[PDB]
Design a protein around this ligand. Structure first.
Ligand code: C2E
Length: 138
C-alpha cells in the first residue's frame, strides 16, 4: 500500500487536490503518463522528479556537474546499454556501484542487468545527458 505519485505530491504540498483530479480525468481519456500531464499543467519538473525519486527509493541528485565518472565503473555497461536504459555507472562505494538513472521506472531493469549491489540516483533530463556524455564519449 505504498503511495502513488499523485498522493505523494499531494502530501508534499506540491499539487492541489483539484489539480490532481484534473490530471487523472485527462489521463483517463488520453493514457498519458501522470507526471507528464501534471508538469504540462504547471507542476515544476523538479518537483515531479523529487517525488518520483522518493517513490522508488532513489536519491535525487540536484546536480551532476561535480561528478567525475570513474572509467572503471562505466565499463560495467556498454554505451548502448547505458543510453537505452538511461543509466550511468559513475563509481564505487563500499563494494556497490553508484548508478545515475534518467527514469525511475528503469531502476529494476537496470538492477537486474547489473546483477550486483548498487546505489541508485535520479537526475533531471539535462543533468543526466551532461553526465552521460562525459562518461560515454561517442
Ligand atoms: N519517468 C516518469 N515516471 C512517471 C511519470 N508519471 C508517473 N510515473 C511513474 O510511472 C508509473 C506509471 O504511471 P501512470 O502510467 O501515470 O499510472 C499511474 C497513474 O495512472 C495512477 N495514479 C498515479 N498517482 C495517482 C493518485 O494519486 N491517485 C489515483 N487515484 N491514481 C494515481 O497509478 C498508476 C501507477 O502510479 P505510480 O505507482 O505512482 O507509478 C508511476 C510512476 O512510478 C512521469 O511523468 N515520468
Amino acid at each position: 500500500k505504498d503511495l502513488k505519485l499523485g498522493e505523494l505530491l499531494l502530501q508534499k504540498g506540491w499539487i492541489s487536490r483539484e489539480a490532481l483530479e484534473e490530471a487523472l480525468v485527462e489521463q483517463e481519456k488520453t493514457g498519458d503518463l501522470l507526471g507528464r500531464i501534471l508538469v504540462r499543467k504547471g507542476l515544476p519538473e523538479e518537483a515531479l522528479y523529487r517525488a518520483l525519486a522518493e517513490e522508488k527509493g532513489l536519491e535525487f541528485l540536484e546536480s551532476t556537474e561535480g561528478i567525475v565518472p570513474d572509467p572503471s565503473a562505466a565499463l560495467l555497461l556498454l554505451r548502448s546499454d547505458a543510453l537505452r536504459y538511461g543509466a550511468v555507472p559513475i563509481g564505487f562505494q563500499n563494494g556497490e556501484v553508484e548508478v545515475v538513472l534518467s527514469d525511475p521506472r528503469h531502476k529494476e531493469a537496470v538492477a537486474q542487468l547489473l546483477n550486483r549491489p548498487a546505489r541508485f540516483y535520479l537526475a533531471l533530463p539535462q543533468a543526466w545527458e551532461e553526465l552521460f556524455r562525459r562518461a560515454y564519449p561517442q
